[PDB]
Design a protein around this ligand. Structure first.
Ligand SMILES: C[C@@H](NCCn1cccn1)c1ccc(F)cc1
Length: 330
């Protein structure tokens, strides 16, 4: 089997991407944030505290002929950004882009934090990290990918995120029309449950490439690129007037600037992030200070190749017995 679904940025900054997902029978279509940095498929639902719902589409298990309560199971998750949600669990039929899984754990939110309520465009998350991170208790559940792998033509999915444009998630095949050149594959550690890999170095603009190992995760659910303070300082030193603002919570730069590109290594290959991808616009409406898309990881504990980095590439998440990542330019 394969599936192919379009993913669409939620706003003009590419802060997140939503992908339609069919849940239940008859189908209930919800727009989910596909998140390679977590392992729970959770949704706004008929169970979500009414005051915490503001515009989202909800899943109503009682209207699905295929829904069943996963009796006794609960879940609770918090993300890197301090957001959280929790609830109970149903199993139901879930389809993405024409690929169907039966018996998928659909985690129904009873509570969501303010950051989810305030974003009316995201109806829940679909986790695509390793199932060892799934938060369902007392019986951990599998991701949609982990359940689909029993059926896919090839045990892979690919992320092809757009810059201020739609892109694609494919399951079970690699679209050789979607990238240029060749795909460079690199080793993955699953020790922390993430798609964790080691970049071979970086360059700033037209500068020399610095060969240096940078461990980090490929995380479609994180907007920005979080790297070591040394790397980030070297980047922003090339932008006149850029500074790390303690009042704003990272590097800001004059909105009049032209940003340099940023290159990261994948083995002997190089992925170039254009400078405009690193522009996240005014810090507040009408401001002439703009927020940077490359930020320090020093207060996280891990480096994160978020959307800023991933949308410069065609990315293969190889879930073969020994998982690997592939990157191609596009
Ligand atoms: C609550 C939420 N924001 C969606 C992303 N966004 C960035 C700026 C605005 N929206 C979220 C939190 C964590 C996460 F892994 C996914 C989604």
């Amino acid at each position: 089997s394969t599936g192919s679904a379009t993913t669409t940025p939620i706003d003009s900054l590419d802060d997140a991407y939503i992908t339609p997902v069919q849940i239940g029978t008859p189908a209930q279509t919800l727009n989910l944030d596909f998140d390679t940095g977590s392992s729970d498929l959770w949704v706004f639902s008929s169970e979500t505290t009414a005051s915490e719902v503001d515009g989202q589409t909800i899943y109503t298990p009682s209207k699905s002929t295929t829904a069943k309560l996963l009796s006794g199971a609960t879940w609770s998750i918090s993300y890197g950004d301090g957001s959280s949600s929790s609830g109970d669990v149903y199993t139901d039929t879930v389809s993405v882009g024409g690929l169907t899984v039966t018996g998928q754990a659909v985690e129904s939110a009873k509570k969501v934090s303010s950051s989810f309520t305030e974003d009316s465009t995201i109806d829940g998350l679909l986790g695509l990290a390793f199932s060892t991170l799934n938060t369902v208790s007392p019986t951990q559940q599998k991701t949609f990918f982990d359940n689909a792998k029993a059926s896919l033509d090839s045990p892979v999915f690919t992320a092809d995120l757009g810059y201020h444009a739609p892109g694609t998630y494919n399951f079970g095949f690699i679209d050789t029309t979607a990238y240029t050149g060749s795909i460079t594959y690199t080793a993955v550690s699953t020790k922390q449950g993430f798609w964790e890999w080691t970049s071979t170095g970086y360059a700033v603009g037209s500068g020399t490439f610095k060969s240096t190992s940078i461990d980090g995760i490929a995380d479609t659910g994180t907007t920005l690129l979080y790297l070591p303070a040394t790397v980030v300082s070297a980047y922003w030193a090339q932008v006149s007037g850029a500074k790390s603002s303690s009042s704003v919570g990272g590097y800001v730069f004059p909105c009049s600037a032209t940003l340099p590109s940023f290159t990261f290594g994948v083995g002997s290959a190089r992925i170039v992030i254009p400078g405009d991808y690193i522009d996240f616009g005014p810090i507040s409406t009408g401001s002439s200070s703009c927020f940077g898309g490359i930020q320090s990881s020093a207060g996280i504990g891990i480096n994160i190749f978020g959307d800023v980095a991933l949308k410069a590439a065609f990315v293969v998440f190889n879930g073969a017995t020994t998982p690997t990542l592939g990157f191609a330019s596009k």
